[PDB]
Design a protein around this ligand. Sequence first.
Ligand SMILES: [Cl-]
Ligand SMILES: [Cl-]
Ligand SMILES: [Cl-]
Length: 165
Amino acid sequence: DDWRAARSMHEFSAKDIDGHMVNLDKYRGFVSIVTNVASQXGKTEVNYTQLVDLHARYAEAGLRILAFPSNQFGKQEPGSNEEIKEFAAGYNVKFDMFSKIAVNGDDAHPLWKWMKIQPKGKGILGNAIKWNFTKFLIDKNGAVVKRYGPMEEPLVIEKDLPHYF
Ligand SMILES: [Cl-]
Ligand SMILES: [Cl-]
Ligand SMILES: [Cl-]
């Protein structure tokens, strides 16, 4: 379990929503938001629209967003990767969509196993992802800066970006 000894997001890779294997070292030098998404959650609309807004306002300063669909919370992402891709396109998403994953348990994607054990990656109750739309803010070196729970609208994160963004 090599993931445990990693010191950066940039040590990981993940399949994008089209099936292309992305080396997350592409995000070296960028501030990144990593979030678990779902299409059938009461907060789906507010999260997608606000992430799109953040991306529009800060991509040019170096903000990147990595969205990982997951069906682990109320079976609220039951669709295929192709269907999720078209769903996100209906919100005019131009940030990076990934293939559906698990975020908790032994079969969770290793990036998510890693984020949860970082010093600033624990939730208020504990490490497990609790619901759809948990967010992690990741610095230019790939370290976890802060975690935001399901109820935190993406605009909350804006206040924690570098002041010159
Ligand atoms: Cl993967
Ligand atoms: Cl981008
Ligand atoms: Cl929590």
